[PDB]
């Protein structure tokens with residue numbers, strides 16, 4: 001029933017993601033000195049520190065908006081990878097599976113709480 005509960009649930013999931021070794025390449029914005037052509041390929045950079053900062057600033061209205069930004073971290077890695085066998089892309093796929101497994105109940109509970117609110 002709690003329409004605000006998603007925020008702490010997302011904070012806790014972000015904490016789990018930061019402890020995951022698979023999140024290392026994605027914890028901060030991609031370094032343009034390490035990947036000089038990055039912005040030629042990727043239009044909208046995104047990383048987990050930016051997601052956490054947006055959440056903590058009260059700049060997400062719903063968990064769907066947070067989920068769109070986290071999914072952008074993964075689609076950027078898939079677009080930038082030179083190979084479907086690359087180390088960083090392989091880390092993104094495992095981290096995406098972990099994220100999707102945990103965000104599903106957050107989205108469901110929020111949408112159900114919102115439907116109850118507008119009943």
Ligand SMILES: CCOC(=O)c1cn[nH]c1
Pocket residue numbers: 025026030035076077078080081082083086087088089
């Ligand atoms: C973090 C920026 O780099 C990537 O996303 C990447 C690099 N190789 N495969 C994917």
